Amino acid sequence: PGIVELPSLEDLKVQEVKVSSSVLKAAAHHYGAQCDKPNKEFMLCRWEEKDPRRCLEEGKLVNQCALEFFRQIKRHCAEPFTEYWTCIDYSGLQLFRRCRKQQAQFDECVLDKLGWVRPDLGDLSKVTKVKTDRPLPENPYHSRARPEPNPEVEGDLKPARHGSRLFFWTM
């Protein structure tokens, strides 16, 4: 067996999205609409390549889009967004249904100042299609050549030559 090739620690550095899950939860619906393209490109790479080392550049673009997404909230909608995810953060299950009044304020804000429309029920679970210039991998499983099948037996079935040929039998 060979050597497992690993990227260097310097290849793995990227600005991190260091916000808590209640913050991601609060912005998730608008994040799904805004950052769909780099997100869906990266997920296509992962299910096609089946190898984390082969999708690191797409992974960094995922972070870069999320950081620009959250900077846009910070520039125009910081106060309505903080009121909303704090409301989410209070719940032990982080429930949307307990925060509709604060969600509406955060939603009226991004729609007005950023043009963001919250995707409708069922939208973010759609299967989509992405145009990637990354070539389709040929042998993602790294399969060896398969063993050759046994020769196919063919022809016309004829009666057994002189029958069963069991000891003395003539049939």
Binding site: P1, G2, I3, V4, L6, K50, D51, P52, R53, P140, Y141, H142
Partner: protein
Amino acid sequence: VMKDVPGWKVGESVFHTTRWVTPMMGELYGLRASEEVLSATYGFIWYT
């Protein structure tokens, strides 16, 4: 640690295939403090 062990190859796979293999718990945390290993292994199961 294995610089002087004779015949050792660093980072050698145990699999014939060169396909990426998901590492198990020991591979990731095999050299780390027991506390992080407790959390990684039994934290979810032991969380109320």
